[PDB]
């Protein structure tokens, strides 16, 4: 009795896999040094680009921490993330000063890799129209960092635009799976002002403002400003003390319900949205809002 799936005759590689081949080549290029390429029409070598001088963090180290905790991506993906961070910070066309790996967003057709970077020259932000909540300029609470998003590690790398309070307010109303491509209508109702990229940027803003933390006492909050100066006298806690949520604090400013880190009051009465007072800047994770009670 011949079994059902006896044999099949397929080519070595499907003839419709150019995109996967390009992604694989881009991810492989992250390793080693770029070999010099001789020019066409002659034998003279093409001089490589002069690299940019940037700053980053230890990606193998926190990859090891996350592997020890059993969270995050694999240890074989954190190394590629390090190499992608190095490639991004090393490029001269897009001049960054600091780089950091935000994370990874799943999708129904592709996934998003997100890096938060500050630039050496912030681009131009169009002025807020009349009758709308004024936008936060680059460097402020919601637009402190500029984000880059790619589909596969390495490869192309787009820059997400800034985020406006309207987009943040509209994002809190809807609930979607990310299609994986950056040009896709998020929703018809509730209406969303933008394509997939704007929704992704708003989600990133909310998540970053909610779930980016630093160990307690690491920083000291500026007495009148909203700045954090590194604490010189900080004594590390050891072992399982960093499992209690009382020993962590919010590293970024609380996102108000208006759509901004700081409320914009009209000039004279005010609504309750404008009088929204938040927590102290370095807010502990213990003093956070619990989820609603379930049936059980």
């Amino acid at each position: 009795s011949t079994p059902p799936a006896a044999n099949l005759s397929v080519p070595l590689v499907p003839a419709a896999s150019a995109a996967a081949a390009a992604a694989a080549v881009a991810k492989a290029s992250l390793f080693g040094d770029p070999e010099p390429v001789l020019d066409p029409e002659s034998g003279e070598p093409i001089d490589p680009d002069a690299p940019n001088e940037f700053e980053c963090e230890d990606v193998e180290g926190d990859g090891d921490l996350l592997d020890g905790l059993g969270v995050g991506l694999g240890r074989q993906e954190m190394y590629a993330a390090m190499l992608a961070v190095k490639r991004l910070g090393e490029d001269a066309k897009r001049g960054v000063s600091t780089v950091r790996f935000f994370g990874k967003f799943f999708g129904t057709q592709a996934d998003y890799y997100v890096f938060e970077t500050t630039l050496q020259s912030n681009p131009d932000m169009p002025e807020a129209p009349e009758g709308t909540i004024p936008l936060e300029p680059y460097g402020e609470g919601v637009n402190a960092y500029i984000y880059f998003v790619s589909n596969t590690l390495g490869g192309p790398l787009q820059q997400l635009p800034y985020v406006t309070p309207e987009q943040i307010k509209a994002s809190r109303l809807l609930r979607r799976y990310l299609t994986g491509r950056l040009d896709a209508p998020v929703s018809a109702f509730p209406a969303f002002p933008g394509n997939e990229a704007n929704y992704l940027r708003a989600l990133i803003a909310r998540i970053s403002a909610a779930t980016v933390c630093c160990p307690r006492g690491f920083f000291t909050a500026d007495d009148d400003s909203a700045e954090l100066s590194a604490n010189d006298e900080w004594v590390p806690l050891k072992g399982r003390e960093m499992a209690l949520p009382v020993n962590w604090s919010h590293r970024y400013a609380h996102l108000k319900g208006q759509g901004r880190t700081v409320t914009h009051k009209r000039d004279p009465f005010w609504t309750a949205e404008e009088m929204e007072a938040g927590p102290p800047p370095l807010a502990t994770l213990d003093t956070d809002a619990p989820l609603p009670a379930a049936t059980g």
């Binding site: 005759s9 397929v10 080519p11 070595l12 590689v13 896999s17 150019a18 995109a19 081949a21 390009a22 992604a23 694989a24 080549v25 881009a26 290029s29 770029p34 390429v37 020019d39 066409p40 029409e41 034998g43 093409i46 001089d47 490589p48 680009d49 001269a92 066309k93 490869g155 192309p156 790398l157 787009q158 820059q159």
Partner: protein
Amino acid sequence: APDPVLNELYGSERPAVELLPGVPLSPIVNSCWLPADAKAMLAESWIPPAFEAAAPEYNELVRRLAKTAPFRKWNELTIQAKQLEQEVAGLKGPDAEAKQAELENVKVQIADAEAAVAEVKQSFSDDPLSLTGWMQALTDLADGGMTTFEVSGQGWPYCSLRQLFGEMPSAAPPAGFFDGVERVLGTFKRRYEKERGPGSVQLMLKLAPNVFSDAWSTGGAPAAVAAVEAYVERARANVFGPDGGVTPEGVPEPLDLVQLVWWDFAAADPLPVLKALQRMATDQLQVVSVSEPKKIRGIGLVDFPADRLKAAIQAGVPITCVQVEHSVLVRSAQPVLDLCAKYGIKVLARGGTLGGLLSAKYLGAPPPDPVRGDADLDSVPGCLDAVNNVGGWARLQAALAVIKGIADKHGVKPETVALRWQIDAGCFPLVTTRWSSRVWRQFGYEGWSSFEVSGGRPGVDGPLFQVESFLDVEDVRALAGLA
């Protein structure tokens, strides 16, 4: 009227066709795979008792010189001189003076023709790239009847993937894959057009933009149009040298055709690049007065699916030809054939012989092995993929036995049958040229390298370039049954 070249060479009544209103098209198109790199090929030089019978001067030049237009004109002028001398000797009257004036005119014509003959004979020896192996190969190919060419090479997936989908440094020139092939074909074109004919040899390029690159993705439509314009400029610099790129009247001479090959459709739609190439193919009138003269005479597409080709038709793009893979054993793209028949656009058939795998050998042989390597084929892993898509080596053996029987029925090589099957389906064939003592092997002929055995005849056979097919109804039934 039939093509004069194909009339004398094969007794063929086939009338010449035109791909575009200006440029003609040969019955079979030669895809040009370089055997070595262009650098190792552009450096080759033909220049090495009181008499050397084996010296290239007495052997190669006497054949390459008699094929030039100045020498033919010299011979014809001598013929007319002798004739008109005969009649003027016969007449001996008042008309004899006018005829003697005609003889003096043809005498000065002979003088200038002989000066040109000496000029071209000197031009033979003062350039190294002429008379080499590959230049002679392409010259013989063009003199055989297949004057159209096609830049191609090892391609996705059997090639370096870093040279296709890799990010070049910023300082690098805007040169893409299939670069040196253009330079070699341009050198051949200029040499051939200097020897004989103003526009005798055609050339159909190939544009393969790396749509996965960072610049293409982050740029947009202006980046795409800038990239295609840069490619067109570089291709003009390649086909025509820095001098001679423009006609003496001041209007640039345009390219023959540009083939667009797209890598992924769900990544980036080819509408912007198609519109840009259309605008480069059309000249923008102002009042009437021509402005921005055409740089490309036509646009073709490669391996687009039927739906995408229809979508490109629906956007106004003047597509003139499409090349697809459609052989006697592979019939995966039938819809494209019907769509092109409806819209009246030429179609080119790559494959046919599965890369020389339908030859006299392999009839009972084991499958070729990549690591060990086979040289009669062009790409071993591509041949194995073709075998797997057919189904296996056993099915290919059965099909090759059937084809060999059909061939021996008439007396033709086992590959002319497949090529004539391709021609009968309307599509134009696309055969890969062969190199280095394997010349004419793509048509099945063997031991055709030396002049002693060839005698100047082409390594093809007449039945392939014929208006009426030599395939009887039983043969057609068998080949249709091959599937």
